[PDB]
From Swiss-Prot:
This is Delta-actitoxin-Cgg1a. The modification Hydroxyproline is found at P3. It comes from Condylactis gigantea (Giant Caribbean anemone). One of its GO terms (cellular component) is nematocyst. Disulfide bonds join C4-C44, C6-C34, C27-C45. InterPro entries: Myo_ane_neurotoxin_sf.
Length: 47
């Protein structure tokens, strides 16, 4: 995977770091879209 943020990463809140992850090709089997967009090629999701 790769570290990748969400739509509401946390501009003024705790734990705002890359706790989300990009899965290229498409997402991981237990995660979901944390944003409307995804990536260049890939897709960002959270858990």
């Amino acid at each position: 995977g790769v570290p990748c943020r969400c739509d509401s990463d946390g501009p003024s809140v705790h734990g705002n770091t890359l706790s989300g992850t990009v899965w290229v090709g498409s997402c991981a089997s237990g995660w979901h879209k944390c944003n409307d967009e995804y990536n260049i090629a890939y897709e960002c999701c959270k858990q």
